[PDB]
Design a binder for this molecule. Structure first.
Ligand SMILES: Nc1nc2c(ncn2[C@@H]2O[C@H](COP(=O)(O)OP(=O)(O)O)[C@@H](O)[C@H]2O)c(=O)[nH]1
Ligand code: ALF
Ligand SMILES: [K+]
Ligand SMILES: [Mg+2]
Lengths: 766, 51
């Protein structure tokens, strides 16, 4: 009878097994223990069956050391790195090839005529590049590129598919840009296969703008510079410097961006675009001869200075661009009358030369990263472990689940609270809430008559009306709060000096959802009304012990009121001579008035001890004249306020003296046959309420332990499952700086594997 | 029929548990009457009154 919710769950839980254990045992334990093992061993077979078919498309199985997915290893390493750390602290050490040049140059053309002319939005009229776009190029058949690493199935040779693919990239480009600028560092990941593509990662960084026009947000050019740090602070970056062939080199921006990155040109190759505009204006090949020699290019870029040319139409196909480029370069005086042989100028030579320089840098520098990340992990683990010796290995998934079980365990522990605590806490809390209402609004005005029948009649009518409207509504609220008060203590209270504060955000977050769903039984009040009516209706106290308990607790309530009034009075009247002379204090003129106003009222009560609480205006006038006769002029309102506090002090002392004789007078045996005027009807009123609330608490406790705590437990389970799925809150709640460090350690460990996997793939040559 | 077959078996356990809890308390408070009915109660009075 102490608790019934736990028994119900066990009974039906066994029933479920009795009917379905022959299916549950296989699914719940046998399958799950083998499930993890088969992931390593049997999924291996299905992965290999498809992988081999995919490798045949790659040709990796057919040809040793030659596989189109071999270059995809390089991108996988960077994809983890960008997710692990997209900031300069990690990005600055990641090898890459970047397209750098004046925005007007159309610098991206170096990549458009390879694969991107079909799927990347282009054309003049507006700035196209909005954020760094990385394209993973690989020798292979035509295949729809990955867009934001998302799979696609499109034909790259038909306009209808390509147009939709151009839309997809544009959406990422603009969405990466936030208010205040037109460019964003947030990168876009593309991976395309097709003929003529080289194994390398080329990034089209947003074009630099000398000045921010009114058509662009003010921070455009500063943002591009910060994005330009992808190479300016990256010793592993290869820079393709694009000179806008429409304008002279002395008008360029790229010269300063790269010359401050590598003034020796060791990390860069200079490329020129739109050279054919030289013949749409008065061509000056003598300036081109300086261009090839790098006289006017401070970065002294190394390699052959390739040139890109195009019809300028934004619909020219990749094949059309290649054919146009070859014919123009092989005949134009810009290159035929200067030392720029077309077979070195052609973009396809740049793609090969860029691919050649790409693998040179990657193999040389990649091994340094493996040592760097390993050193990082050891330094992080040493400090992380020393500050958190308890957690040698931690994850945010492990952190959440521990709380999930811990929370459910505590709420169950809350369900283990004995009724003794519930009944005492509910009874004590509820009575204290309504202890003054009865005294001030029911008892004291009823005490103004000497007719005990009216006294009991008056209160009973008020109580029944009060009972119907207030008592069960306050009682449930106390019970609802009382359960939450213990729940919070069970939930988030520390175990002395040991406490995992890392879990407090989730615990309180779970509570708020669980209390919102904690709807107390809407009919609990109806039972209490019947109970309270019966508890009040039965006023028969035939037991001395019932009398003894009721009177002592009534005294405490009255003594509390007496001190409450007395403390208010002392402030109203101030210190007496004992404290005025002891602490060198004095009275305010109001306190002086109150003391004399008190004295006159005390004298009035000294004789008229039975004076009713209500004062006649003649008494108010009499006091005023009695005080005015001593030089004290008092507003009637002061007297009435003084009167109320002093009267209760007078009354309450009388009531306690009545209580003293009620217990003592009846206690003496020979006095029980003396019918004195000591009808302790207040003890009858107090006793019934004490019993009435005690029964109320028991009804609340029964509902508390039978229905409400189970609803609280059920809601917690519903909320915790929502949190289990709510990754963002789990991240937002689990921010303890050790799980985040543990998360970083995991990512570092993964990168070390990914770094070595690619490095291991480099070592396939020997 | 999906809901009825799934949940109906729970009722059988619930009612059986109800009877055992009711019989335990009912029998303990009324050990004399292991089985009682309002028809048996009336007839006993009928004979008792006539006697
Ligand atoms: N004349 C000429 N036009 C080009 C060349 N490369 C690209 N374009 C034109 O520039 C426009 C878009 O090229 P794109 O590489 O996207 O430059 P961006 O949009 O300014 O970054 C298209 O209309 C192309 O025809 C080139 O080498 N010569
Ligand atoms: F014109 Al650009 F990136 F070269 F928008
Ligand atoms: K442009
Ligand atoms: Mg562009």
């Amino acid at each position: 009878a102490t608790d019934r919710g736990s028994e119900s769950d066990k009974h039906f839980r066994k029933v479920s097994d009795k009917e379905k254990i022959d299916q549950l045992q296989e699914e719940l334990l046998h399958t799950q223990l083998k499930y993890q093992r088969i992931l390593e061993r049997l999924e291996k077979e299905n992965k290999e069956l498809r992988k081999l078919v995919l490798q045949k498309d790659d040709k990796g199985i057919h040809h040793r050391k030659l596989k189109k997915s071999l270059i995809d290893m390089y991108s996988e390493v960077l994809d983890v790195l960008s997710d692990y750390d997209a900031s300069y602290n990690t990005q600055d050490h990641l090898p890459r090839v970047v397209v750098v040049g004046d925005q007007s140059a159309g610098k991206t053309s170096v990549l458009e005529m390879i694969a991107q002319a079909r799927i990347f939005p282009r054309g003049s009229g507006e700035m196209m590049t909005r954020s760094p776009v990385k394209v993973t190029l690989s020798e292979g058949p035509h295949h729809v590129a990955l867009f934001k690493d998302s799979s696609r199935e499109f034909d790259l040779t038909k306009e209808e598919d390509l147009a939709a693919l151009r839309h997809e990239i544009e959406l990422r480009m603009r969405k990466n840009v936030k208010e205040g600028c037109t460019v964003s560092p947030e990168t876009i990941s593309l991976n395309v296969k097709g003929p003529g593509l080289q194994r390398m990662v080329l990034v089209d960084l947003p074009g630099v703008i000398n000045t921010v026009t009114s058509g662009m947000a003010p921070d455009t050019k500063e943002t591009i510079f910060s994005i330009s740090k992808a190479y300016m602070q990256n010793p592993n970056a290869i820079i393709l410097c694009i000179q806008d062939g429409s304008v002279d080199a002395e008008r360029s921006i790229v010269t300063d961006l790269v010359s401050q990155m590598d003034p020796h040109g060791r990390r860069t190759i200079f490329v020129l675009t739109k050279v054919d505009l030289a013949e749409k204006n008065v061509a000056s090949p003598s300036r081109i001869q300086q261009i090839i020699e790098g006289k006017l290019f401070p970065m002294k870029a190394l390699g052959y200075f390739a040139v890109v040319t195009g019809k300028g139409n934004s619909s020219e196909s990749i094949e059309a661009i290649r054919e146009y480029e070859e014919e123009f370069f092989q005949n134009s005086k810009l290159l035929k009358t200067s030392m720029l042989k077309a077979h070195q100028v052609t973009t396809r030579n740049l793609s090969l030369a860029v691919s050649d320089c790409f693998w040179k840098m990657v193999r040389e520098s990649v091994e340094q990263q493996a040592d760097s990340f390993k050193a990082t992990r050891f330094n992080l683990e040493t400090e992380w472990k020393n500050n958190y010796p308890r957690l040698r290995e931690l994850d945010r998934n492990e952190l959440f689940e521990k709380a999930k079980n811990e929370i459910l365990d505590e709420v169950i522990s809350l369900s283990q609270v004995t009724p003794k605590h519930w009944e005492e806490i509910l009874q004590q809390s509820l009575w204290e809430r309504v202890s003054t209402h009865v005294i001030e609004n029911i008892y004291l005005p009823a005490a103004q008559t000497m007719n005990s029948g009216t006294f009991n009649t008056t209160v009973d009518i008020k109580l029944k009306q009060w009972t119907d409207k207030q008592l069960p509504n306050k009682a449930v609220e106390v019970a609802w709060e009382t359960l939450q008060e213990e729940f919070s203590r069970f939930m988030t209270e520390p175990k002395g000096k040991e406490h995992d504060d890392i879990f407090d955000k989730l615990k309180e977050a779970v509570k708020e959802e669980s209390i919102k769903r904690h709807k107390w039984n809407d009919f609990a009040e109806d039972s209490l009304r019947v109970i309270q009516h019966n508890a009040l209706e039965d006023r028969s106290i035939s037991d001395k012990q019932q009398w003894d308990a009721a009177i002592y607790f009534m005294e405490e309530a009255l003594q509390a009121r007496l001190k409450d009034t007395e403390n208010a009075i002392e402030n109203m009247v101030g210190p007496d001579w004992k404290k005025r002379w002891l602490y060198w204090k004095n009275r305010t003129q109001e306190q002086c008035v109150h003391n004399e106003t008190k004295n006159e009222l005390e004298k009035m009560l000294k004789c008229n001890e039975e004076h009713p609480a209500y004062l006649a205006s003649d008494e108010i006038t009499t006091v005023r004249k009695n005080l005015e006769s001593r030089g004290v002029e008092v507003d009637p309102s002061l007297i009435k306020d003084t009167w109320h506090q002093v009267y209760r002090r007078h009354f309450l002392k009388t009531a306690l003296n009545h209580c003293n004789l009620c217990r003592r007078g009846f206690y003496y045996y020979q006095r029980h046959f003396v019918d004195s005027e000591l009808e302790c009807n207040d003890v009858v009123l107090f006793w019934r309420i004490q019993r009435m609330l005690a029964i109320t608490a028991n009804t609340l406790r029964q509902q508390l332990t039978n229905t409400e705590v189970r609803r609280l437990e059920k809601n917690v389970k519903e909320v915790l499952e929502d949190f289990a799925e709510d990754g963002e809150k789990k991240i937002k709640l689990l921010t303890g700086k050790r799980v985040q460090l543990a998360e970083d350690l995991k990512k570092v460990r993964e990168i070390q594997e990914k770094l070595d996997a690619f490095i291991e793939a480099l070592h396939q040559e020997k």
